[PDB]
Amino acid sequence: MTEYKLVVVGADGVGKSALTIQLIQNHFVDEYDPTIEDSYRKQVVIDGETCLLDILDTASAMRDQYMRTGEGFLCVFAINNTKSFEDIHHYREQIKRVKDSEDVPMVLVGNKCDLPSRTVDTKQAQDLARSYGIPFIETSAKTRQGVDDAFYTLVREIRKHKEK
Ligand SMILES: Nc1nc2c(ncn2[C@@H]2O[C@H](COP(=O)(O)OP(=O)(O)O)[C@@H](O)[C@H]2O)c(=O)[nH]1
Ligand SMILES: [Mg+2]
């Protein structure tokens, strides 16, 4: 069993918890306590490898250690929250600085894609992710669209960066 240490970051309210809980429990939780920061484990087979994902859902001693030793990052904004998208810069800078590197496994996630009349269009997100050299994936924690894709792609990005 190979462990992968994953960190979910982004502005409060974007769906970091709802995404994590979909991955772990396959349901959509409407109002998960926005103050709870914790780690979760999930056993999953990805490309014939049995993975034990160690995931921090950020909301701290524990956060500092996951930032320092985390292998990959899901940087989440919501497609109907322009501010959360603009804030991605701050999260990306935080990660670059803890790892002293521009080359960190990361996926840009645009969540809440089930909601109408987005204020962040897909091209804007593609543009930002292209500048950072990382994938962009749309998700809905409500419908589960893209949830497995976002996490599996992050695991693949970690492999692309380092032997595991
Ligand atoms: N419609 C929709 N609502 C969502 C989605 N993800 C999260 N939410 C809602 O957005 C709010 C914040 O979600 P939450 O997971 O707590 O965000 P966190 O602070 O980033 O962990 C809650 O009301 C969730 O039900 C989604 O993909 N679609
Ligand atoms: Mg949360």
Curated annotation (Swiss-Prot):
Gene3D superfamilies: P-loop containing nucleotide triphosphate hydrolases. One of its GO terms (biological process) is response to mineralocorticoid. It is found in: Cell membrane; Endomembrane system; Cytoplasm, Cytosol. Changing residue 14 to I: In NS3; affects activity and impairs responsiveness to GTPase activating proteins; characterized by a strong increase of both intrinsic and guanine nucleotide exchanged factor-catalyzed nucleotide exchange leading to an increased level of the activated state. It is linked to Leukemia, acute myelogenous: A subtype of acute leukemia, a cancer of the white blood cells. AML is a malignant disease of bone marrow characterized by maturational arrest of hematopoietic precursors at an early stage of development. Clonal expansion of myeloid blasts occurs in bone marrow, blood, and other tissue. Myelogenous leukemias develop from changes in cells that normally produce neutrophils, basophils, eosinophils and monocytes. It is a lipid-anchor. This is GTPase KRas. One of its GO terms (cellular component) is plasma membrane. The gene is KRAS. Its EC number is 3.6.5.2. Interacts with PHLPP. Interacts (active GTP-bound form preferentially) with RGS14. Interacts (when farnesylated) with PDE6D; this promotes dissociation from the cell membrane. Interacts with SOS1. Interacts (when farnesylated) with GPR31. Interacts with RAP1GDS1. Interacts (active GTP-bound form) with both SHOC2 and PP1c (all isoforms) to form a tertiary complex; SHOC2 and PP1c preferably bind M-Ras/MRAS, but they also bind K-Ras/KRAS, N-Ras/NRAS and H-Ras/HRAS. Interacts (GTP-bound form) with MAPKAP1/SIN1; inhibiting K-Ras/KRAS activity. SMART domains: RAB, RAN, RAS, RHO. The modification N-acetylthreonine is found at residue 2. Alternates between an inactive form bound to GDP and an active form bound to GTP. Activated by a guanine nucleotide-exchange factor (GEF) and inactivated by a GTPase-activating protein (GAP). Interaction with SOS1 promotes exchange of bound GDP to GTP. It comes from Homo sapiens (Human).
